[PDB]
Amino acid sequence: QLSKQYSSRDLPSHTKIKYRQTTQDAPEEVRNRD
Amino acid sequence: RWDYQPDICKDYKETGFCGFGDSCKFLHDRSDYKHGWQIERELDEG
Amino acid sequence: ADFPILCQTCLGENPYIRMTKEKYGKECKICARPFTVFRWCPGVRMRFKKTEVCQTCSKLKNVCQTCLLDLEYGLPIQVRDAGLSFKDDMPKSDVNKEYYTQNMEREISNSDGTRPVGMLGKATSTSDMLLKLARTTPYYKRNRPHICSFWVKGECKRGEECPYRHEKPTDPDDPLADQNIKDRYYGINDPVADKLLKRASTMPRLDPPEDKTITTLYVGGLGDTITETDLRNHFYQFGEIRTITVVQRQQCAFIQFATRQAAEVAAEKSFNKLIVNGRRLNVKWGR
Amino acid sequence: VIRMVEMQKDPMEPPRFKINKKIPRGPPSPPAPVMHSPSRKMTVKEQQE
Amino acid sequence: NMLNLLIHRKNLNYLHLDYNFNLKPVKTLTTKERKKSRFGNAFHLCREVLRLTKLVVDSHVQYRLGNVDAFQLADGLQYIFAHVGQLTGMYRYKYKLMRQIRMCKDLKHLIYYRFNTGPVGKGPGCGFWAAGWRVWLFFMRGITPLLERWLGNLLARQFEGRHSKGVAKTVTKQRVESHFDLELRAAVMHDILDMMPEGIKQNKARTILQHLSEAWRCWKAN
RNA sequence: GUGCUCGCUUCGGCAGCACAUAUACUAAAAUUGGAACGAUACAGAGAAGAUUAGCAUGGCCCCUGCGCAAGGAUGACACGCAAAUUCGUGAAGCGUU
RNA sequence: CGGCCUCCGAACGGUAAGAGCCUAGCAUGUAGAACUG
Ligand SMILES: O=P(O)(O)O[C@H]1[C@@H](OP(=O)(O)O)[C@@H](OP(=O)(O)O)[C@@H](OP(=O)(O)O)[C@@H](OP(=O)(O)O)[C@H]1OP(=O)(O)O
Ligand SMILES: [Mg+2]
Ligand SMILES: [Mg+2]
Numbered sequence: 195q196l197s198k199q200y201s202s203r204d205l206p207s208h209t210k211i212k213y214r215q216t217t218q219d220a221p222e223e224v225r226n227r228d
Numbered sequence: 229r230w231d232y233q234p235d236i237c238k239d240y241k242e243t244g245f246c247g248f249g250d251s252c253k254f255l256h257d258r259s260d261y262k263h264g265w266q267i268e269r270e271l272d273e274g
Numbered sequence: 275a276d277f278p279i280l281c282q283t284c285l286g287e288n289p290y291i292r293m294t295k296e297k298y299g300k301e302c303k304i305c306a307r308p309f310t311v312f313r314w315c316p317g318v319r320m321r322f323k324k325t326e327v328c329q330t331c332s333k334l335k336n337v338c339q340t341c342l343l344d345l346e347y348g349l350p351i352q353v354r355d356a357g358l359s360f361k362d363d364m365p366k367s368d369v370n371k372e373y374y375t376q377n378m379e380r381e382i383s384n385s386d387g388t389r390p391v392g393m394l395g396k397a398t399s400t401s402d403m404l405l406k407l408a409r410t411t412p413y414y415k416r417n418r419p420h421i422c423s424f425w426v427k428g429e430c431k432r433g434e435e436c437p438y439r440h441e442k443p444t445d446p447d448d449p450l451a452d453q454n455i456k457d458r459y460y461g462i463n464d465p466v467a468d469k470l471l472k473r474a475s476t477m478p479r480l481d482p483p484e485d486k487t488i489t490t491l492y493v494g495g496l497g498d499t500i501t502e503t504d505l506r507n508h509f510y511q512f513g514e515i516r517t518i519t520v521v522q523r524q525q526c527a528f529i530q531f532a533t534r535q536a537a538e539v540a541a542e543k544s545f546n547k548l549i550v551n552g553r554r555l556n557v558k559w560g561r
Numbered sequence: 562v563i564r565m566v567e568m569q570k571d572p573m574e575p576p577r578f579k580i581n582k583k584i585p586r587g588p589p590s591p592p593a594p595v596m597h598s599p600s601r602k603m604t605v606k607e608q609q610e
Numbered sequence: 611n612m613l614n615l616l617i618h619r620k621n622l623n624y625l626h627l628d629y630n631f632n633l634k635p636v637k638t639l640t641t642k643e644r645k646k647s648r649f650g651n652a653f654h655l656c657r658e659v660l661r662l663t664k665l666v667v668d669s670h671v672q673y674r675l676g677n678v679d680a681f682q683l684a685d686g687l688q689y690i691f692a693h694v695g696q697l698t699g700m701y702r703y704k705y706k707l708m709r710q711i712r713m714c715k716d717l718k719h720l721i722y723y724r725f726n727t728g729p730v731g732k733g734p735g736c737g738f739w740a741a742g743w744r745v746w747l748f749f750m751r752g753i754t755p756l757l758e759r760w761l762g763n764l765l766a767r768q769f770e771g772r773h774s775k776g777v778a779k780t781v782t783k784q785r786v787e788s789h790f791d792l793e794l795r796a797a798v799m800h801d802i803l804d805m806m807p808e809g810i811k812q813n814k815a816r817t818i819l820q821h822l823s824e825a826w827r828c829w830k831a832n
Numbered sequence: 833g834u835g836c837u838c839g840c841u842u843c844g845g846c847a848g849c850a851c852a853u854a855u856a857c858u859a860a861a862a863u864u865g866g867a868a869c870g871a872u873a874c875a876g877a878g879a880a881g882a883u884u885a886g887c888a889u890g891g892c893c894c895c896u897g898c899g900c901a902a903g904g905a906u907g908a909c910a911c912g913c914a915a916a917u918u919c920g921u922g923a924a925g926c927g928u929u
Numbered sequence: 930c931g932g933c934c935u936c937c938g939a940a941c942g943g944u945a946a947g948a949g950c951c952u953a954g955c956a957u958g959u960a961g962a963a964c965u966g
């Protein structure tokens with residue numbers, strides 16, 4: 195029972211996740227740090 | 229087009245009295261009179 | 275669904291059956307909600323059928339999702355239930371029925387897809403009454419079309435392609451005419467079911483005698499392929515027998531019993547159907 | 562051995578069924594057992610405090 | 611046909627949509643009908659876009675029926691596109707149209723004040739309708755997904771039903787004080803009157819809440 | 833049905849080869865059942881003395897709206913209020929005399 | 930050698946709410962269909 199109604203806000207948007215890069219603070223450097 | 233519904237404060241028209249008084253955003257008018265479509269329809273059915 | 279649930283009659287004859295599927299095709303008049311619809315080509319120039327009840331609405335009472343009759347016997351559900359002495363509490367009103375259907379699907383979700391839920395197994399003692407009212411061959415008149423109302427007034431000008439059997443229409447004065455599908459499913463006053471009741475009431479069964487001390491039972495139509503120990507093994511562990519007279523000058527028998535209810539069990543279950551080595555014996559209480 | 566075919570859905574077809582049906586919520590679960598410490602009734606003094 | 615089916619499926623017998631796509635009532639409508647028969651920017655934006663295309667098609671029908679002319683057809687088309695403002699009345703349903711309407715005026719100015727460079731007169735004999743045609747076509751490029759979404763939702767709500775069951779409405783500007791109090795007095799009822807009781811009986815939470823509201827009135831009155 | 837057999841073999845057919853391969857909610861119907869917010873009429877408007885603004889909570893109530901916005905008499909309904917509770921009634925049960 | 934020229938309109942908020950009542954529509958187009966010695 196899945197309706198066909200819909201929303202302006204549920205349109206696709208921000209569809210890639212920004213992954214935390216090498217310089218910012220990756221879980222790797224958190225693995226290291228003192 | 230034809231601008232169909234005139235603005236006839238129906239409380240006034242039927243009972244001579246509108247609770248809003250001066251601010252009634254409609255036309256204080258007790259005049260019975262054949263409308264813009266009544267006559268058309270009756271004549272064509274005639 | 276995986277596929278429908280219907281009897282052989284509704285199911286078809288050709289080895290290769292052709293049925294088209296539509297997901298969420300229409301509304302089970304029982305579960306009231308969307309179901310899948312599989313549509314099967316019944317027979318040559320025979321009306322294409324379609325699945326007509328939710329598969330859960332089916333596993334509820336264990337009947338045919340198209341043919342509407344039980345899947346083991348194949349008699350009206352009122353009948354089959356009563357032949358198991360079965361008494362279902364299925365709710366009827368709108369809100370009550372929706373709540374019932376919802377929790378029913380929840381409870382059936384915990385099943386393995388093999389057999390109907392609930393008393394449908396604890397009533398599985400299919401009584402010889404049901405066995406005997408059960409039809410034998412595929413009454414395949416079901417897949418013949420309607421009465422081509424044109425062809426009933428004359429009008430069916432499409433040649434032989436009248437979409438419906440151009441015969442004489444049944445006088446709806448017959449109780450076998452207007453049985454509302456919902457009522458037939460609810461076991462609600464099915465006149466065809468009352469006809470099956472009258473038939474299984476008039477159908478021959480063994481008669482009881484008057485005095486308790488008539489514990490001699492005459493079995494008519496024996497023949498000379500029978501033994502006294504074979505008459506025994508017919509009526510021996512079904513209680514205790516006291517004596518037996520195998521009348522070979524009249525081709526009958528007479529079991530004097532040691533338990534009256536045991537005699538009743540053996541004989542009444544044996545009425546015309548105690549078929550050992552193929553001879554139609556008649557179980558009665560002797561003189 | 563049976564051939565299933567999927568029947569076309571018509572594109573210009575509105576929804577078919579009244580979805581918005583309200584009923585109460587179904588009965589919950591088999592209640593858990595209350596594995597509580599021994600509970601103490603309070604003095605009437607405490608009660609008035 | 612589509613729009614009439616919509617009305618008459620909604621059971622609005624007292625309204626009738628005529629052939630230039632004006633909606634006109636055939637009675638005097640009571641309140642309940644005045645209200646039940648209201649329509650929104652989806653319905654009216656289609657109505658008026660259909661009216662624009664019908665005016666275009668019917669200028670072409672006049673020409674091919676043979677009444678007018680090639681030149682009269684071109685000038686009429688130029689008119690229609692420049693004057694969309696006073697033929698249709700779409701601006702009232704998407705007031706962002708006046709982007710387009712100002713664009714067609716500006717074109718109208720450019721084309722004309724270069725068109726009459728010589729003896730040519732400042733009168734009706736100018737149909738050069740490439741530009742406004744472009745304009746309204748881009749407007750349509752944009753409006754088709756919007757209207758598809760709005761009309762899908764209108765139809766869905768028409769055939770399934772409106773879901774008043776799981777709405778979950780935001781807290782906007784008029785429910786800010788009401789909501790602060792829902793949650794203040796919920797928090798109280800969680801907070802002590804059920805997690806520092808030992809008033810075993812029935813913890814009189816309904817009365818500790820009455821204190822709380824009188825403590826507030828007394829703070830406010832000093 | 834279309835062609836070709838070096839087919840009989842005449843220009844009649846017969847035949848063989850090839851090629852060509854499974855439509856369809858069968859129905860012009862006949863049914864069968866509910867609403868039209870329309871008449872009809874009855875009805876007949878929150879809080880505090882009067883006259884009135886609203887915003888919410890609850891849910892087998894919805895309506896208009898694209899709407900998670902807004903409106904529909906604050907949309908309607910919510911109405912006994914139970915409730916313990918203050919004294920005694922009693923019964924059950926454990927312990928003392 | 931100088932050129933500088935905003936705007937523009939529709940809806941809700943406004944002419945109660947109701948139960949009954951009665952009848953078009955609008956939907957359905959289905960399922961089935963009988964037996965013996
Ligand atoms: O109604 P509009 O589309 O805005 O245009 C008309 C008109 O032209 P159209 O009626 O044929 O479009 C005039 O232009 P002429 O035909 O007289 O050349 C006039 O121009 P002026 O005002 O400069 O005299 C002006 O059009 P424009 O936008 O070019 O001014 C006027 O509309 P407005 O006077 O409101 O602009
Ligand atoms: Mg008051
Ligand atoms: Mg509101």
Ligand SMILES: [Mg+2]
Pocket residue numbers: none
């Ligand atoms: Mg008000």
Ligand SMILES: [Mg+2]
Pocket residue numbers: none
């Ligand atoms: Mg108001």
Ligand SMILES: [Mg+2]
Pocket residue numbers: 906
């Ligand atoms: Mg409210």
Ligand SMILES: [Zn+2]
Pocket residue numbers: 237240245246247248249252253256
């Ligand atoms: Zn007034």
